[PDB]
Amino acid sequence: ATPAYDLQKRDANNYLLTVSVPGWKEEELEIETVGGNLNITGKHTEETVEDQTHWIYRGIRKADFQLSFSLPEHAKVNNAKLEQGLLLVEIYQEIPESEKPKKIAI
Amino acid sequence: ATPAYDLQKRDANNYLLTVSVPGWKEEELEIETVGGNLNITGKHTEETVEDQTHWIYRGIRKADFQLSFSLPEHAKVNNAKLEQGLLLVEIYQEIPESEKPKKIAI
Amino acid sequence: ATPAYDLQKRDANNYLLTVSVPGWKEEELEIETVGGNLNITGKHTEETVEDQTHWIYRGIRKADFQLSFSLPEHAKVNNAKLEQGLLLVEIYQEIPESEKPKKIAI
Amino acid sequence: ATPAYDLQKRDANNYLLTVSVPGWKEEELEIETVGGNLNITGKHTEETVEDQTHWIYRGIRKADFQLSFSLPEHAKVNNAKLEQGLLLVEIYQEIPESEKPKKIAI
Amino acid sequence: ATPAYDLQKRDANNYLLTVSVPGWKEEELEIETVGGNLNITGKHTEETVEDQTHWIYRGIRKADFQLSFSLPEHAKVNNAKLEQGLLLVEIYQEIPESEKPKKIAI
Amino acid sequence: ATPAYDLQKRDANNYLLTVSVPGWKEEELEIETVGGNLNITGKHTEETVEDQTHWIYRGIRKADFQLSFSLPEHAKVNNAKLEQGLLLVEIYQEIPESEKPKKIAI
Amino acid sequence: ATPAYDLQKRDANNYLLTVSVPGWKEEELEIETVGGNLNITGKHTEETVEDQTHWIYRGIRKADFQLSFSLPEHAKVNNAKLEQGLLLVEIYQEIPESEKPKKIAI
Amino acid sequence: ATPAYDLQKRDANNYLLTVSVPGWKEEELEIETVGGNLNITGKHTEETVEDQTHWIYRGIRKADFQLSFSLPEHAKVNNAKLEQGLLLVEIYQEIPESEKPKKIAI
Amino acid sequence: ATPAYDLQKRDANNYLLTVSVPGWKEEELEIETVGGNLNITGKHTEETVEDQTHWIYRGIRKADFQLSFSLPEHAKVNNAKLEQGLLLVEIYQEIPESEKPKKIAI
Amino acid sequence: ATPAYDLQKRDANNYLLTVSVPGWKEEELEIETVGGNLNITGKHTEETVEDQTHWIYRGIRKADFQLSFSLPEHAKVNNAKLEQGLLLVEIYQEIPESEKPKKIAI
Amino acid sequence: ATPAYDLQKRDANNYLLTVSVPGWKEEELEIETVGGNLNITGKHTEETVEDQTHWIYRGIRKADFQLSFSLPEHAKVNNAKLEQGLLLVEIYQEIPESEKPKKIAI
Amino acid sequence: ATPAYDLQKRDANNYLLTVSVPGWKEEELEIETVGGNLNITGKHTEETVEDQTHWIYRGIRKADFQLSFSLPEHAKVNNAKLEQGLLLVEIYQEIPESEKPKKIAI
Amino acid sequence: ATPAYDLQKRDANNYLLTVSVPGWKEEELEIETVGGNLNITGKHTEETVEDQTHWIYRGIRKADFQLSFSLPEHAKVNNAKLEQGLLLVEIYQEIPESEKPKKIAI
Amino acid sequence: ATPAYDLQKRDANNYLLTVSVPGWKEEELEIETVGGNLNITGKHTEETVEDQTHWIYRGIRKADFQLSFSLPEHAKVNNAKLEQGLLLVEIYQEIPESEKPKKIAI
Amino acid sequence: ATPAYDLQKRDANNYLLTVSVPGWKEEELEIETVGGNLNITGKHTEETVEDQTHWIYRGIRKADFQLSFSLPEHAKVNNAKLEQGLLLVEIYQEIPESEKPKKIAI
Amino acid sequence: ATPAYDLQKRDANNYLLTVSVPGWKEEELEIETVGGNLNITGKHTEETVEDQTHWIYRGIRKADFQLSFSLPEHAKVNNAKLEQGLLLVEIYQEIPESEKPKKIAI
Amino acid sequence: ATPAYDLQKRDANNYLLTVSVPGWKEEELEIETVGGNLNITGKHTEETVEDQTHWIYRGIRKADFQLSFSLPEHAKVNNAKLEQGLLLVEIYQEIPESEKPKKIAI
Amino acid sequence: ATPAYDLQKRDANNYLLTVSVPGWKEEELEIETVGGNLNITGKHTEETVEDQTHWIYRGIRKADFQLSFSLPEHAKVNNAKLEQGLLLVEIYQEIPESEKPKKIAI
Amino acid sequence: ATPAYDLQKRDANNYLLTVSVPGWKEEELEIETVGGNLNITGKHTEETVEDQTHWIYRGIRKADFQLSFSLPEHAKVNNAKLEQGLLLVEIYQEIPESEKPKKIAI
């Protein structure tokens, strides 16, 4: 079971990844950039004896996980903010020497 | 698409509801108490046309919704607190003048 | 075959039932409130020799029927109007001593 | 979803169409005579956003529509009268100078 | 269940319809010519309490019915005779200004 | 293809057979009493070649046939009358010196 | 749907038929002995407008019916009593000149 | 095998149960009122070994049984009368101080 | 595998049985009339070492057999001739005191 | 489970029934002659509770039973002898004054 | 339907064909020798209309037919004899100057 | 089995029918013009009994037949010529005073 | 494979056909009005050796074709313009002496 | 996997629950009465390294569990004894003001 | 698709092949006798641009083809005539020194 | 097909085999003890021409057979008696030096 | 239904059987040692008729039974102790003078 | 629904894309060059509500869309010309300094 | 999942077992000889937190296990060497007093 995720392009220079991580905390998330690939890794730090007597129902599941995504050379990350249960990660890279849309003919 | 939810019962007089609500603004959320029944209604306040060309992938779902639960008399809500995209709703009550958890004989 | 029917809530104090009854007349409909249940009953008063020679096609069917619906204690009916082939029945009851929607926390 | 309809023929020169149209306003309805063909077009003039939370149940359908029938020459419409949600449309004509319904021999 | 029926052409000017109507009587059959169509209609005039104690077996069924057949303009009926359980109806019309079969070539 | 048939029993000593025989000439029909058994044999006396081009439709069937029924001793035939294409055959007998239809006690 | 029925032999001279006929009355049942066969016939004498409003549920069905059973020559009926919803019919006949069970050998 | 049963409701305060119980002796029958619930228990008091050689056919079933129904407060039984193998049980009650069966408006 | 057989009626007094018995001989066939039943019995008298080397193909099979047929009282056999591989057996009995075919009515 | 049985016919006047009845005591067996019909009824007189722990295997079946056969008039039983667990029952009769087993012609 | 046939080979120079032909007249039969091939053609000379009412059963088949067999050079027919409904056809030939059936060594 | 047919249209006023009719004699063929409809009726004038022994193979079919086509007013037949087993039938007409095949604009 | 096509009504006097014909040229399209029917016909004028070496992929197919559509009497074509790969054909006809939509009653 | 369980009624005032709990100990079982519901909860207190080398086979499984059962108001528990691997729990409540079974009528 | 074909034997000396070849011409058919085999070969000499605009329907297909048939040594062809769309080819060969049909025996 | 068989233990020292062998005789059964295995062998000594004419029906089958059963060392047979179609064989062996059932603990 | 069982082996000379036996009285239980084989036979000493009306639910099964296990020589039983519904049976033995669990080399 | 497209490659340095875009306005079309990738995005600028009553048929599809293709370095677009509803897009490039198409040896 | 294993016979006195145990160590393997059976037992001594971040892929699985094999009396083990991931175990036993292969005859 993996957390929901989206990717948008702010521009040719921009990728933005949005991941749903409810209950996920500052200490619980660690990320690494290795060999042109970005890895986003969740870990539940520890277990708590959960009284199955205490809870009648659970529909919400979280699991430790790692996500891997190949990054185009040569990429730079702008910011990562966790707000409203959302992980927003800003990533910058560009200059293929073509941003330019143009034509018309007849 | 409906949000996953967990419900905890702390004691004979109290249970706790846990709802995953990522990306949701308090401004998007409304709650109602009617006839001993709790209705939780999410409303996305407004939408913005986004060019799907700019969005490469969407795994994350957004929808307006309503949930309903009949609560036994006589109910009072303690707190509903939103943190890191989760809604925790405190519910405390009971009085049938019996809590008593004991016996064995022979 | 039963007539189409809808139910809306004007407020906690209000239920509104809308039933489609084309061709249904003042004398043809009788309703009764018994044991906390509302019964809406149609009866075709009588038969008319119908010349099957006279009509080539019929798509519209009506049948004698009774509808039964359990009413929450302790209910009162406001009005019932038959207009434009519609049966509109206004029903009032309330005061669980909770109309009140409220909360926010953090 | 299309409305059930009945068609009656009173005589060699006359038939009658019966349409179920509950909740419909005359203001919502348009009829057209074109090329010996009758077109009956319902149009819901406008809609109102209704919160489905307020509506518990809908069995009753609402839609804009058009119906078409080629009518043999030479047709004239007598009346279309709307009562208790039904549309009765009067159609009278024929002249092939032959009505004659009789014979037997041996 | 409909009675057996046949159609023969005596000539370009002639159609002959033969229908099996055992037990069918002078009063029981009525026919009508309307709008270029011929209708042949059976009616059992009435019911007779039939003692199901009186009859052990029945293989022969009769039912009230109407038959409709589009007639080419401009048609005239010659005779209808009921004999030996047979309905024979003679119908005349002609003069397309071609009765004429002819050719040979090489 | 065999003709539909009905059999009526008027009393302990009498039953009546009803046969549908449209288009049949008495000249086409033969009956036989052999060994307490009744044999009803239809024979179409002769056929005429008809050009199927002149006949557009045939729903009506014509065939030679024989029917057989063992009748309990001691049988005598009263009448067989042909009217409007139906054959009614009268059969009267019995003598086990017992007709008696009655009793109840307690 | 036919009423439950049983047959027992009191002796070589005796048959006893037991039929369940709840709600069946003195006037409602008529029996006849004809041609060595016994017929037991129920008839509901008449209909009563039954208010389908008056009854919510019926599991018990009764229908008009006739039962026929071939009787060995030469049979005599002793008694028929209706008691506790039961139809008991006593029937006597005998004397094949063998009642006699006997043998042993070696 | 359980007995067919019918239930009639004579009025807002009264309903009637109809049970088919052929061959049953009052001595075989027991009824019980416990917690607002009616239990109807048939008990065949005793059995007699019957030689199945003497019994040629059994269509009629015999079994001990119990039936249960929760009855809304506050119930009182009027009569249970056994006639011609049927048990009719009278049940009368209600008091929510509302019988009122009327309205229409416009 | 049984030999082909046919039965014809020469008259009410006559039955004729024809059985195919190729290779069947005078000594090989024996018949018996017992208890109103006729039995026709074939027996291959003996075996002959058959050289399976001598014959490449056989399509014709014969087997020892017995045929049994219930004869109406009180029957007499006229003649049995074996000719051209055919068994022809003539059987006479009659006089139900009905040979007589007759009727016509109207 | 019913016993295998063989039936032999020694002559036109006599047939012999062979029944396998191992472990059966003559004391367990009863025979009856009723209405020209033979009934053979085995009855195990009594059973003894046997501990299935002491019995490792049972392939052999034991049951009470009744068999029935209609015998044509006029029947007399000669002998029924039980030897080495088999019941042989002698049956001799006939007199239609015809035994005659012969003819052939040409 | 084709007749069963057997073929026997008496020696290297001779084989024998056996055909079942019951009811066949020599007058019905024709044989032909063409191109070293034998053709056996049965022809039923003529038919007689038989009333199927007089014939109760037919198991025996009658049809005209032709059979063909290529025979190796150089063939001569010895005899074809018809007895008790069987056709035996004698065929003798061969000369490849080799009959010799022997050897073994080591 | 019906003959393959081709239909050619030479112009707005003319179409040509092509029928394959091998082995057919003009003497076998009849054509008819009735009510603006063309009927083409083949009739094999007579048949000759052919011994199927003389015929080794038949792939070629022979049957009497009729074909029908409604032709729009106002039709005249030009020629029907039979050559090398094909029937070519010339049909010329039209006059709605419009042939005109042209336009394009911008 | 046929080109996409649409039909709209500008009024009772108007039909407009829109066909997609990319790559279709002035010389390539020819239309004809014959017998009340309009035919729109494409023809690729000629072939060009297409180097299958020159093109790696083709998703767009064009084929020679003809479209036929029955035109109501008595029709006139206004204009046909090929613009933006679109064929727009304007067609006029009218005057059934009914353009008139009207009614309301009660 | 849950332990086997039974429920008996000693009287209107009595329920008795019997649960099979082999190996279950004094410390291992805890029960609680909360909100009109009784919960019976097993817990294995701890784990013991089980040598899978030590045991070749186990057919008996025990698991930690909780059972929940809604109790009618207003209930009292008498005794709970663990004997012979059985959990017996006595529960008392009553006085609907009907213990009373009674009736007979006619 | 191959043309229909038949083969008949005029005598032992004769084969006759009949092939349907409508539209097939003098120049279009060529035949060859090679190695004891006869080959009949059709060729459409050439193609004609066929206006698919000119013909609405074709049911008749012709294709170039070759037929091959092994001829018994030593064969001679008499005549080949194309008449009425028929190819008739006369072929002679004989003298196996057996034309002779003969036998009868007993 | 093998005869029914049972095995019981009279004690640790005892096995008893019971086999059903109806019609089986003193001379017909031979048994042998070989290599610790007991073999029970039936043989029908000889055949008797059985007239299939003499018997109409046989349900009882017997076949020659041998049964083999491994015997525990070191076994001794007590007695074998054939009575009432039963083969009873007494077999003794024992002394594992444990006959002894005992224990109780706590 | 057979009881779940576990078997433990404490050492080379000893294994332990664990049986679940809830509700069982020692008085109900019997054990036997025969031929090195252990037989455990439960016997419910007697039953009491319980009214299933008093018993609302039964999940718990009660049956008499026997279990068998061949035990290798030379076996002795240590103890069988019943506690909290479990039977633990101690079995100790072996002497093949080899326990030795060790080696490794290279 | 996506538009059919063809792609042509004129030479090692050049390929041509062919897109079908009927009814499309240049004003509706946008193209983009990003990261060596070509994106072709159609956008219908705006829509007009059309009454589907006026439109009898739609086979022609209209939708906004985006297409994407990674183009190998180093790409430059020559022309994109729209004619008669087709978009032809010119793409020229390559320089791996190798075009050479030749050799053969031996 | 169990490790691959092979068994070879060096001679009548010899068995050799070869087991694949990659990664298996001196401390990890323990074997025991008990009751004529050899047990080979693997145990992973302990767990190591394995970083699932550290390893992307594993195809090689090892599990704790025990193997059991019945040894013929009276067996002796020679050597066990772990080399190249192989477990080689030498086992000796012999002297059935037959090693001897011999024979030829005629």
Residue numbers in the entry:
A (entry chain B), B (entry chain A), C (entry chain B), D (entry chain A), E (entry chain B), F (entry chain A), ...: 40 to 145
Quote what the paper states about this structure.
The construct AgsA:DelC formed only 24-mers in solution. AgsA:DelC, differing from AgsA:DD only in the N-terminus, formed 24-mers similar to those formed by M. jannaschii Hsp16.5 (MjHsp16.5). Cubic crystals of AgsA:DelC in the I23 space group diffracted to 4.1 Å resolution. The application of crystal symmetry on the MR solution of a dimer in the ASU yielded an octahedral 24-mer, similar to the assembly of MjHsp16.5 and S. tokodaii Hsp14. Though the search model lacked both termini for both protomers, successive rounds of refinement yielded clear density into which we could build the C-terminal extensions of both subunits. These termini containing the IXI motifs (residues 143–145: Ile-Ala-Ile), bind in the hydrophobic groove present between strands β4 and β8 of a neighbouring dimer related by a crystallographic 2-fold axis. As observed for MjHsp16.5 wild type and its N-terminal variant, this AgsA oligomer is also charged on the outside and hydrophobic inside. The C-terminal extension in the AgsA:DelC construct forms crucial interactions to enable its assembly into a 24-mer. Constructs possessing an intact N-terminal domain (AgsA wild type and AgsA:DelC) were better at preventing the aggregation of chemically denatured lysozyme.
